[PDB]
């Protein structure tokens, strides 16, 4: 990365502090890194911090030459999606093959898959690309979690 | 020269902040290079346009009882003299703390900058109320043993006296030191009795 | 102190707070260093100079450690025209010539 | 429209039945033949299938449909992360105002702004003046459409 | 700024009292010497070793140089980290009183452009580099100008 | 030491009240343990407008207004050519005693010092509205029968006079004196020239 | 009333209007009251939609 983006990396660890010492929660960090123009899975993250479980997920820290580089070890990266893997991938809700997806359904997956969302999670990412029955455009409802 | 702007602002600035390390002695406190105004500008400052039509006239809505130099001021010589006559203080220790509000007149054009200076000065909100509101979780508060544990063990450690003292003082308030308002009881919406 | 102030002068993770962490760090135990009274946040130390002791403050020391005499102006100083300096400049030889 | 990606390797090519390409997706975590039932629109399952492949379909999707999750998780922290992003200097400057405590409810510019503050009108103002006539057309537009 | 009378008040350059970068605490006074009449007495030193009047106008504006030794300074840039040049004027008072060039000396007080091997070590000073060797040299003026 | 501070707290003077107005007092401050002087508040500054947003602005810009001569006070000829120069004079007399509510020297401050400290005169325009608004059973207006009879019969009386002059000058609609009007009528953004 | 038919009369009450409205700090204000009514009149009509 360039210094440049860095300092503005530097910044959004230095914000994100606890004791005052240069210090981020393992929690934190895909977080952080998320803003920083990736995306990176929990299960991508999890590999790079070491399988914590929800105690020591929460309890263990980061410091910067820790974050930066993890930032750096998914950053170049490998699999990571475009627009016609994503209609298939968000054709994902057809109920018969519609051109329009399930609004029930489409929060479920995210509570019921793999990286289980909250409720809030999904409520947030469909609500009001559905219409009057529930049927959301996929189409572009990739588009909008592709870009934003 | 320009330095003449800052001998008017040897006046006004020292209004910021030159002997502000007082109890706490000596330190490293507002420069004399000029692009340094701009570090005495920090958050916590708001500062109404010229022809306000007024909230920068509200300060004429109590001009009264509080000027010195009435075709309409407070100079120098008035938070050297006015805050021992109306808000707080300074010992040549903390001289220019509260007397770096004014060094230098207070012109009602400088009334606007003093209300700015209210709301502004002193650390104000952005820093006082987050100091702990950022500790905080959200819509919340510290818990009060968590806040002794701070007070003495986390950094220049204090004594049993300074405990105690800000003890009885702590707005305990359901288990916990309500911060927001530790702080920002210097503040609101409601009150026109100090400071000024 | 010097030493380490000529490599924190030339150091950008270095604030003259880490200049005497550096100097805590490197001396300490020494039968003629002394930390200061507790005051690290103004950042000083005492120390035991063959007539005993002194504190100094580190604010804003590690330029006042840094005259790195740039050659490029010391050589326009030694070939100078005027009636002020050819003379007090022809000491050429300790210049940064790397 | 779930299963999808079990099988990243399996459906390519844009867009694909839906129906049959369940089983390209089903048949890469093994499902067995005997234990998942497709209708038209419904699926069926034995005793013990379903859903520990519903589970262990959380482990193989993974590759896409944990990078849909994942993506949404990203979109979505972009704004809500928060929570943390401060309190550094701000505690240490709970210590600046600790080592005065002791003249910290001690202190200079307090209340005199606003009691006479409920009184007056010229307020906020000329923040107000040039964003008010912004205001003033938006809110206009805004009820319309509603 | 005391003993300052209107004409050269323009004339040698003078913003007034407090209106200064950095002459902080405003108008601190001084016990039992008064800075006004100080003026003439230490205007009047510079003649016995022998200073001219050219030097001597020039000596005015080492005032002038000496606030604008509180302004050669690379303020420290905040953006870029290697800070630069405030005044030219400042330079030009300064390099002319020290009998090299102006142009000659910011050049390399910004760049130095030394050479080690091929490489005509052509860069930039930091603040801490360049402000020293300008600091080196806006108190090396203060130095090797004393 | 701890002093140089306290020195200076004079000059206050120099410029406000008191080069008229030692009635206007200089408070002492200031005891030289400058942690004392944490007691000198001045708590509490409300009630209804006193500066009102539409009267107390005027009159100090009538400073720079009716300082005809423009020396920086306000002479005989000051009251009366500025005064002229609107309309209707003050007889030397009505002037004089005019000048007389301050001993002498009435400048930019013994002017503010006398207007402001005035607090009394005349009830609000809203305690007007409530005079016969409180008088109404319902929301609806008042018979004018019953302003007639009781201007006349009932607490402080009139003459007939002193209601025909009221009375002609009084909105009658309706058989009904619609009061509101009257009271904006008889005292809103009042007429000018009588004082300062 | 009665200060109608007598109190309209001292020296140091009467000085309102001719020229001070011309000392300013109210023309904004007569558009942003008028404007203030309908500004409230278009925020809550819009919310409670």
Same mark, same amino acid.
């Given at each position: 990365?360039?210094?440049?983006?860095?300092?503005?990396?530097?910044?959004?660890?230095?914000?994100?502090?606890?004791?005052?010492?240069?210090?981020?929660?393992?929690?934190?960090?895909?977080?952080?890194?998320?803003?920083?123009?990736?995306?990176?899975?929990?299960?991508?993250?999890?590999?790079?911090?070491?399988?914590?479980?929800?105690?020591?997920?929460?309890?263990?820290?980061?410091?910067?030459?820790?974050?930066?580089?993890?930032?750096?070890?998914?950053?170049?990266?490998?699999?990571?999606?475009?627009? %016609?893997?994503? =209609? +298939?991938? #968000?054709?994902?809700?057809?109920?018969?093959? &519609? *051109?329009?997806?399930?609004?029930? @359904?489409?929060?479920?997956?995210?509570?019921?898959?793999?990286?289980?969302?909250? %409720?809030?999670? =999904? +409520?947030? #990412?469909?609500?009001?690309?559905?219409?009057? &029955? *529930?049927?959301?455009?996929?189409? @572009?409802?990739?588009?909008?979690?592709?870009?934003? | 020269?320009?330095?003449?702007?800052?001998?008017?602002?040897?006046?006004?600035?020292?209004?910021?902040?030159?002997?502000?390390?007082?109890?706490?002695?000596?330190?490293?406190?507002?420069?004399?290079?000029?692009?340094?105004?701009?570090?005495?500008?920090?958050?916590?400052?708001?500062?109404?346009?010229?022809?306000?039509?007024?909230?920068?006239?509200?300060?004429?809505?109590?001009?009264?009882?509080?000027?010195?130099?009435?075709?309409?001021?407070?100079?120098?010589?008035?938070?050297?003299?006015?805050?021992?006559?109306?808000?707080?203080?300074?010992?040549?220790?903390?001289?220019?703390?509260?007397?770096?509000?004014?060094?230098?007149?207070?012109?009602?054009?400088?009334?606007?900058?003093?209300?700015?200076?209210?709301?502004?000065?002193?650390?104000?909100?952005?820093?006082?109320?987050?100091?702990?509101?950022?500790?905080?979780?959200?819509?919340?508060?510290?818990?009060?043993?968590?806040?002794?544990?701070?007070?003495?063990?986390?950094?220049?450690?204090?004594?049993?006296?300074?405990?105690?003292?800000?003890?009885?003082?702590?707005?305990?308030?359901?288990?916990?030191?309500?911060?927001?308002?530790?702080?920002?009881?210097?503040?609101?919406?409601?009150?026109?009795?100090?400071?000024? | 102190?010097?030493?380490?102030?000529?490599?924190?002068?030339?150091?950008?993770?270095?604030?003259?707070?880490?200049?005497?962490?550096?100097?805590?760090?490197?001396?300490?135990?020494?039968?003629?260093?002394?930390?200061?009274?507790?005051?690290?946040?103004?950042?000083?130390?005492?120390?035991?100079?063959?007539?005993?002791?002194?504190?100094?403050?580190?604010?804003?020391?590690?330029?006042?450690?840094?005259?790195?005499?740039?050659?490029?102006?010391?050589?326009?100083?030694?070939?100078?025209?005027?009636?002020?300096?050819?003379?007090?400049?022809?000491?050429?030889?300790?210049?940064?010539?790397? | 429209?779930?299963?999808?990606?079990?099988?990243?390797?399996?459906?390519?090519?844009?867009?694909?039945?839906?129906?049959?390409?369940?089983?390209?997706?089903?048949?890469?975590?093994?499902?067995?033949?005997?234990?998942?039932?497709?209708?038209?629109?419904?699926?069926?399952?034995?005793?013990?299938?379903?859903?520990?492949?519903?589970?262990?379909?959380?482990?193989?999707?993974?590759?896409?449909?944990?990078?849909?999750?994942?993506?949404?998780?990203?979109?979505?922290?972009?704004?809500?992360?928060?929570?943390?992003?401060?309190?550094?200097?701000?505690?240490?400057?709970?210590?600046?105002?600790?080592?005065?405590?002791?003249?910290?409810?001690?202190?200079?510019?307090?209340?005199?702004?606003?009691?006479?503050?409920?009184?007056?009108?010229?307020?906020?103002?000329?923040?107000?003046?040039?964003?008010?006539?912004?205001?003033?057309?938006?809110?206009?537009?805004?009820?319309?459409?509603? | 700024?005391?003993?300052?009378?209107?004409?050269?008040?323009?004339?040698?350059?003078?913003?007034?009292?407090?209106?200064?970068?950095?002459?902080?605490?405003?108008?601190?006074?001084?016990?039992?010497?008064?800075?006004?009449?100080?003026?003439?007495?230490?205007?009047?030193?510079?003649?016995?070793?022998?200073?001219?009047?050219?030097?001597?106008?020039?000596?005015?504006?080492?005032?002038?140089?000496?606030?604008?030794?509180?302004?050669?300074?690379?303020?420290?840039?905040?953006?870029?980290?290697?800070?630069?040049?405030?005044?030219?004027?400042?330079?030009?008072?300064?390099?002319?009183?020290?009998?090299?060039?102006?142009?000659?000396?910011?050049?390399?007080?910004?760049?130095?452009?030394?050479?080690?091997?091929?490489?005509?070590?052509?860069?930039?000073?930091?603040?801490?580099?360049?402000?020293?060797?300008?600091?080196?040299?806006?108190?090396?003026?203060?130095?090797?100008?004393?």
């Amino acid at each position: 990365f360039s210094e440049e983006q860095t300092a503005e990396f530097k910044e959004a660890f230095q914000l994100f502090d606890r004791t005052g010492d240069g210090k981020i929660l393992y929690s934190q960090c895909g977080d952080v890194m998320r803003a920083l123009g990736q995306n990176p899975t929990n299960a991508e993250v999890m590999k790079v911090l070491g399988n914590p479980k929800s105690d020591e997920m929460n309890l263990k820290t980061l410091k910067f030459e820790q974050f930066l580089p993890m930032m750096q070890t998914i950053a170049k990266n490998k699999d990571q999606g475009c627009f %016609e893997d994503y =209609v +298939e991938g #968000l054709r994902v809700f057809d109920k018969e093959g &519609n *051109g329009t997806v399930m609004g029930a @359904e489409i929060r479920h997956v995210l509570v019921t898959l793999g990286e289980k969302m909250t %409720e809030e999670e =999904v +409520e947030q #990412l469909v609500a009001g690309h559905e219409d009057s &029955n *529930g049927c959301i455009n996929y189409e @572009e409802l990739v588009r909008m979690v592709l870009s934003g | 020269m320009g330095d003449d702007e800052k001998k008017e602002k040897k006046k006004k600035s020292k209004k910021k902040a030159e002997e502000e390390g007082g109890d706490a002695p000596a330190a490293p406190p507002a420069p004399k290079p000029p692009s340094q105004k701009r570090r005495a500008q920090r958050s916590g400052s708001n500062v109404f346009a010229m022809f306000t039509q007024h909230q920068v006239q509200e300060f004429k809505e109590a001009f009264q009882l509080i000027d010195q130099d009435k075709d309409g001021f407070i100079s120098k010589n008035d938070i050297r003299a006015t805050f021992d006559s109306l808000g707080r203080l300074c010992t040549e220790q903390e001289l220019d703390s509260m007397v770096a509000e004014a060094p230098g007149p207070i012109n009602f054009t400088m009334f606007l900058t003093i209300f700015g200076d209210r709301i502004a000065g002193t650390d104000e909100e952005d820093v006082i109320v987050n100091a702990f509101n950022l500790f905080d979780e959200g819509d919340g508060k510290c818990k009060e043993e968590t806040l002794k544990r701070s007070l003495t063990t986390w950094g220049e450690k204090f004594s049993q006296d300074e405990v105690d003292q800000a003890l009885s003082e702590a707005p305990i308030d359901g288990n916990g030191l309500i911060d927001i308002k530790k702080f920002a009881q210097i503040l609101t919406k409601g009150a026109k009795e100090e400071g000024a | 102190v010097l030493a380490l102030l000529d490599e924190e002068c030339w150091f950008p993770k270095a604030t003259d707070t880490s200049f005497v962490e550096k100097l805590i760090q490197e001396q300490g135990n020494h039968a003629k260093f002394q930390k200061s009274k507790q005051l690290k946040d103004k950042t000083e130390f005492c120390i035991l100079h063959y007539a005993g002791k002194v504190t100094y403050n580190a604010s804003a020391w590690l330029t006042k450690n840094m005259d790195p005499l740039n050659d490029n102006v010391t050589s326009l100083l030694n070939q100078s025209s005027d009636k002020f300096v050819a003379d007090l400049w022809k000491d050429v030889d300790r210049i940064v010539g790397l | 429209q779930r299963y999808e990606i079990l099988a990243a390797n399996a459906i390519p090519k844009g867009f694909m039945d839906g129906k049959q390409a369940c089983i390209l997706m089903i048949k890469a975590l093994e499902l067995d033949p005997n234990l998942y039932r497709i209708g038209q629109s419904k699926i069926f399952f034995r005793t013990g299938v379903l859903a520990h492949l519903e589970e262990e379909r959380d482990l193989k999707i993974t590759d896409v449909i944990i990078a849909f999750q994942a993506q949404c998780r990203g979109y979505l922290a972009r704004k809500a992360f928060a929570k943390r992003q401060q309190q550094l200097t701000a505690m240490k400057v709970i210590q600046r105002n600790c080592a005065a405590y002791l003249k910290l409810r001690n202190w200079q510019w307090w209340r005199l702004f606003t009691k006479v503050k409920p009184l007056l009108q010229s307020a906020e103002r000329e923040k107000e003046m040039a964003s008010m006539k912004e205001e003033f057309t938006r809110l206009k537009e805004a009820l319309e459409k509603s | 700024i005391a003993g300052a009378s209107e004409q050269m008040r323009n004339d040698l350059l003078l913003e007034g009292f407090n209106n200064y970068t950095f002459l902080s605490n405003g108008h601190v006074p001084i016990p039992a010497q008064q800075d006004d009449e100080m003026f003439q007495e230490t205007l009047e030193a510079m003649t016995i070793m022998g200073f001219t009047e050219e030097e001597q106008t020039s000596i005015l504006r080492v005032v002038s140089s000496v606030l604008q030794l509180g302004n050669i300074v690379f303020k420290k840039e905040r953006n870029t980290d290697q800070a630069s040049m405030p005044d030219n004027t400042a330079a030009q008072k300064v390099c002319h009183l020290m009998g090299i060039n102006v142009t000659d000396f910011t050049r390399s007080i910004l760049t130095p452009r030394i050479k080690v091997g091929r490489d005509v070590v052509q860069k930039a000073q930091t603040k801490e580099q360049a402000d020293f060797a300008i600091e080196a040299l806006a108190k090396a003026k203060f130095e090797r100008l004393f």
